[PDB]
Design an enzyme around this catalytic site. Structure first.
Site, PDB file in Angstrom:
ATOM      1  N   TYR A  45       0.977  -1.112  -0.029  1.00  0.00           N
ATOM      2  CA  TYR A  45      -0.035   0.004   0.150  1.00  0.00           C
ATOM      3  C   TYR A  45       0.779   1.425  -0.089  1.00  0.00           C
ATOM      4  O   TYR A  45       2.050   1.386   0.490  1.00  0.00           O
ATOM      5  CB  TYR A  45      -0.940   0.152   1.191  1.00  0.00           C
ATOM      6  CG  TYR A  45      -0.244   0.389   2.538  1.00  0.00           C
ATOM      7  CD1 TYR A  45      -0.201   1.559   3.179  1.00  0.00           C
ATOM      8  CD2 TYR A  45       0.536  -0.601   3.344  1.00  0.00           C
ATOM      9  CE1 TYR A  45       0.694   1.908   4.425  1.00  0.00           C
ATOM     10  CE2 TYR A  45       1.235  -0.433   4.417  1.00  0.00           C
ATOM     11  CZ  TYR A  45       0.951   0.688   4.958  1.00  0.00           C
ATOM     12  OH  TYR A  45       1.810   1.025   6.083  1.00  0.00           O
ATOM     13  N   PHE A  55       2.225   9.747   3.244  1.00  0.00           N
ATOM     14  CA  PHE A  55       2.587   9.553   4.618  1.00  0.00           C
ATOM     15  C   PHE A  55       3.037   8.199   4.854  1.00  0.00           C
ATOM     16  O   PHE A  55       3.638   7.918   5.831  1.00  0.00           O
ATOM     17  CB  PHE A  55       1.629   9.875   5.477  1.00  0.00           C
ATOM     18  CG  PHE A  55       0.406   9.056   5.563  1.00  0.00           C
ATOM     19  CD1 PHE A  55       0.400   7.914   6.490  1.00  0.00           C
ATOM     20  CD2 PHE A  55      -0.738   9.541   4.838  1.00  0.00           C
ATOM     21  CE1 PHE A  55      -0.673   7.188   6.612  1.00  0.00           C
ATOM     22  CE2 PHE A  55      -1.570   8.610   4.647  1.00  0.00           C
ATOM     23  CZ  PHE A  55      -1.764   7.640   5.597  1.00  0.00           C
ATOM     24  N   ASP A  56       2.941   7.110   4.174  1.00  0.00           N
ATOM     25  CA  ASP A  56       3.540   5.931   4.310  1.00  0.00           C
ATOM     26  C   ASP A  56       3.337   5.094   2.983  1.00  0.00           C
ATOM     27  O   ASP A  56       2.671   5.590   1.909  1.00  0.00           O
ATOM     28  CB  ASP A  56       2.389   5.047   5.334  1.00  0.00           C
ATOM     29  CG  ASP A  56       3.211   4.105   5.898  1.00  0.00           C
ATOM     30  OD1 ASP A  56       4.343   3.591   5.717  1.00  0.00           O
ATOM     31  OD2 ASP A  56       2.470   3.430   6.804  1.00  0.00           O
ATOM     32  N   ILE A  75      -7.075   0.449  10.928  1.00  0.00           N
ATOM     33  CA  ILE A  75      -8.289   1.381  10.852  1.00  0.00           C
ATOM     34  C   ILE A  75      -9.346   0.561  10.245  1.00  0.00           C
ATOM     35  O   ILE A  75      -9.377  -0.309   9.505  1.00  0.00           O
ATOM     36  CB  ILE A  75      -7.932   2.638  10.210  1.00  0.00           C
ATOM     37  CG1 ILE A  75      -7.457   2.448   8.804  1.00  0.00           C
ATOM     38  CG2 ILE A  75      -7.055   3.359  10.974  1.00  0.00           C
ATOM     39  CD1 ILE A  75      -7.369   3.684   7.982  1.00  0.00           C
ATOM     40  N   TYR A 101      -8.500   7.721  11.811  1.00  0.00           N
ATOM     41  CA  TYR A 101      -8.093   8.207  13.065  1.00  0.00           C
ATOM     42  C   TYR A 101      -8.792   9.211  13.831  1.00  0.00           C
ATOM     43  O   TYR A 101      -8.588   9.814  14.815  1.00  0.00           O
ATOM     44  CB  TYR A 101      -6.511   8.688  13.033  1.00  0.00           C
ATOM     45  CG  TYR A 101      -5.737   7.579  12.513  1.00  0.00           C
ATOM     46  CD1 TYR A 101      -5.383   6.685  13.639  1.00  0.00           C
ATOM     47  CD2 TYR A 101      -5.232   7.348  11.362  1.00  0.00           C
ATOM     48  CE1 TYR A 101      -4.444   5.529  13.469  1.00  0.00           C
ATOM     49  CE2 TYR A 101      -4.574   6.169  10.968  1.00  0.00           C
ATOM     50  CZ  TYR A 101      -4.081   5.243  11.916  1.00  0.00           C
ATOM     51  OH  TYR A 101      -3.522   4.386  11.402  1.00  0.00           O
ATOM     52  N   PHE A 118      -5.659   5.807   0.183  1.00  0.00           N
ATOM     53  CA  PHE A 118      -4.807   4.683  -0.002  1.00  0.00           C
ATOM     54  C   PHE A 118      -4.878   4.038  -1.480  1.00  0.00           C
ATOM     55  O   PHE A 118      -6.093   3.873  -2.022  1.00  0.00           O
ATOM     56  CB  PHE A 118      -5.108   3.500   1.219  1.00  0.00           C
ATOM     57  CG  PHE A 118      -4.829   3.878   2.468  1.00  0.00           C
ATOM     58  CD1 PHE A 118      -3.729   3.905   2.729  1.00  0.00           C
ATOM     59  CD2 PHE A 118      -5.965   4.276   3.286  1.00  0.00           C
ATOM     60  CE1 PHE A 118      -3.302   4.056   4.573  1.00  0.00           C
ATOM     61  CE2 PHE A 118      -5.796   4.803   4.530  1.00  0.00           C
ATOM     62  CZ  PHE A 118      -4.453   4.705   5.044  1.00  0.00           C
TER      63      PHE A 118
END
Length: 128
Positions: A45, A55-56, A75, A101, A118
């Protein structure tokens, strides 16, 4: 771009039909089977914030992310979204904060009230 497109053209996959998790299938996966609750799922991902920043990424770690589906290890949007995927599928998910979140965010990277984007590839799933 892709986040706008899933926002405007995605399918609501929530049971509540509250548009909290929207999906587009980008690469069609294999057959008809999706994972079941408790399966070990392997995914690649990347995630982006609504300010445009990545961010990731698991790709950047050279290893997939592995979790047990439907157990709240991730999540809510991921438990809901990955459960809809076929092996080999790639999808885009747009995740409102109530399925991510929330007002808390998650320091340092994720602000309060953050809608997350995502791209997710379901590599494999197996029962244990």
């Amino acid at each position: 771009g892709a986040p706008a497109t899933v926002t405007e053209q995605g399918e609501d996959i929530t049971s509540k039909k509250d548009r909290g998790v929207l999906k587009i299938v980008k690469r069609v996966g294999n057959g008809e089977e999706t994972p079941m609750i408790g399966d070990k799922v392997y995914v690649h991902y990347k995630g982006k914030l609504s300010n445009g920043k990545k961010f990731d990424s698991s790709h950047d770690r050279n290893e997939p992310f592995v979790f047990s589906l439907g157990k709240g290890q991730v999540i809510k949007a991921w438990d809901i979204g990955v459960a809809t995927m076929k092996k080999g599928e790639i999808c885009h998910l747009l995740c409102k904060p109530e399925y991510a979140y929330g007002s808390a965010g998650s320091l340092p990277k994720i602000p309060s009230n953050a809608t997350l984007f995502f791209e997710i590839e379901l590599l494999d799933f197996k029962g244990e």
